[PDB]
Subunit: 227 residues, 4 copies
């Protein structure tokens, strides 16, 4: 199951659809443990931390099955928090420890890549991305992990830089994808949500939600407190 044409990157072709969270749908914050300093800025919860963990477990099972028997290289893109990647790796490590333990099944490799914005030399002057050297990914099966997909610009621009070194396959894992006017889709996606700005778990806003372990929409009270 690990081979996939390079031209299918960003299409989510043949993927298992994410959990769908309908528009303006939430849980009551009073039903969950929330930090006392965040209470004044949170009244509703989008994704409970426990529901995030159940979907990340399922994505790790889906990933382990797609690459079983193959050497896998997982890239952690350094945008915002490292939260989602850490949780995903923890479950993949546990599954690896038992499923397929009896073989010369080489364990997965982890890699950390940084990005920097760059203005190309063309008549539009539009932005793109510059990466760390990626030559080590030649002829490898690569999984790129990103906290959330919003416009899809980061993974589109990054994707072209990685295509240039000729990897064997390229897929995307992300915790959330937004339904927006704002095209690129992931292959292993946790949730599909409405077009709103979220915080909590691996997301933040000026460190105000650094100890909040559930996902919520950024409120006007938080924007105000801060600004």
């Amino acid at each position: 199951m690990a081979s996939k044409p390079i031209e299918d990157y960003g299409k989510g072709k043949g993927r298992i659809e994410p959990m769908y969270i309908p528009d303006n749908t939430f849980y009551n914050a009073d039903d969950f443990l929330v930090p006392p300093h965040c209470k004044p800025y949170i009244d509703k919860i989008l994704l409970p931390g426990g529901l995030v963990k159940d979907r990340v477990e399922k994505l790790a099972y889906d990933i382990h099955r797609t690459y079983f028997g193959e050497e896998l290289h997982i890239i952690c893109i350094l945008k915002g928090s490292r939260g989602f990647f850490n949780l995903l790796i923890d479950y993949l490590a546990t599954i690896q420890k038992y499923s397929g333990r009896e073989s010369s099944v080489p364990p997965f490799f982890e890699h950390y890549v940084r990005l920097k914005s760059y203005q190309n030399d063309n008549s539009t002057g539009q932005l793109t991305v510059l990466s760390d050297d990626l030559s080590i990914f030649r002829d490898k099966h690569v999984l790129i992990v990103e906290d959330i997909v919003d416009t899809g610009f980061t993974l589109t621009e990054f994707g072209e830089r990685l295509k240039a070194v000729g990897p064997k396959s390229m897929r995307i894992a992300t915790l959330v994808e937004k339904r927006t006017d704002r095209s690129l889709k992931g292959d292993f996606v946790g949730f599909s949500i409405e077009d709103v700005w979220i915080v909590g778990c691996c997301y933040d806003f000026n460190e105000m939600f650094r100890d909040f372990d559930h996902v919520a929409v950024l409120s006007d009270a938080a924007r105000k407190k801060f600004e």
Copy 2:
């Protein structure tokens, strides 16, 4: 309810002053294909009522609520004896972690865990077996007691046991349960620390089961016709 430790014995089973459980509306479910389900349970499960991670987040919040109610007090927790998957094991895990990291409360006796059976449990002294109480409840005289139960459907087991416990004169009596079913029955028993309020349906998964069919199913669901038919 919660809050102040002391509470009139007469309020047992009324859920007075409690923090209301998470409300799960009638006929509301999740897609089983979004979660990890054992292959052998798949023919019997199309929809999930409560994902296992949602169950754990609610148990964490109930452990918080309980700790705040009994802050600075000696607490006796009576667990209706269940197996490894019972609700009391997860609740105790969270209460033990909160207790271990509450440094300012080191002078308060840590909680005491007790096991009860609802029929006469016989034993032999000093033979190292588990101490399970049944006929003699005298150790609870003048103590703060919390009874922990997997689910309140009719609650008759808790009403009958509660009348026996009252006769020894405990200082306070409260109930913790993961799930309470909605009923039109008047004056039905209610818990004080309740995880979820659900429609009156029969559930399996997590601490619940039906002829061992869902012994490794880590989410809660309504017992289906195909599973009822398998027997």
Copy 3:
């Protein structure tokens, strides 16, 4: 492989030996998190709780290798929330959830049993606890789980009762065994630690509820025995 002659019960034949803890060998209690109320009764620690967890993970793996692909019935000699059986089952459940053959092997069964034949105390909706009738184990592969083996009399007696219903195989898992001065003394098949003959508290073990929140294992002190 799951097969094993019934007469080999209690011999520990063909086992993987347990981790050996030498005589008078301890860790400093100041290096670990200990409940303040227990601090006056604990100066040395025998087994840190994380060392207990690493050995339980290894035992679970050993058990999974022995019974892979077979129908397994695990007997918990009744204990509460801190019993060794709960921790063992947590790791066995994880290996089972990710075993590699989750559609082609039957998941294990858990049973709750009393040591002696008392009158059943069962009722509808309550935990099934077996006492007087052990007949469900006829022709089954059975694993009996106990917190610790000292003299071995408990498991010898219970063992004779289970042999009367004719199980397919019988093995024993225990966290600790004691190095007592006997010959032909019962021993387990999946054992966490071999320790010197001393009386222990902490984790699944206790002494008059004094170590109910103590998550490491230690020897029982005279200060502790004095109090009570």
Copy 4:
């Protein structure tokens, strides 16, 4: 015997007033057969130095010690981007659980996490805890410490999982273990990715070393 945040800056690297680390005597090991080890690692692992569970129990105790020292104060924790983030991640995990279940009695802003390469203005007048996987020569923390002192923090302490008894120097304030002068791998340390899925700590064998050097 103190658990208080204030501390003179000139005490940085001296380990003054610390709780000594667990002492692991020279030539003391555990049998590797008593633990779960990845099959591909087995031929390179002669014996184990520190079981993963022993590491976790020591990190939990360090986290408890850290929480008491800064209780009620705003704390800024720096993860030095040198080697693996394994030790920092485990330490933060325990500190976060203690914080979530500790004093819901107001104020005390929860701790902050920061990642530094190898600019510092944000640490002026702050309580700072610098986290490093292991201390060998002490050169990394001596150099970085002089740059941090320049911005004028309120206090500066160090947390590290292991310190080595090298040949006759910098010491941390919250230290897991004291070991002999050997090169280690596994759990939160690695060598050419060879021990990436190994959950316990061992000494790097010459067979492993010679595979790359």
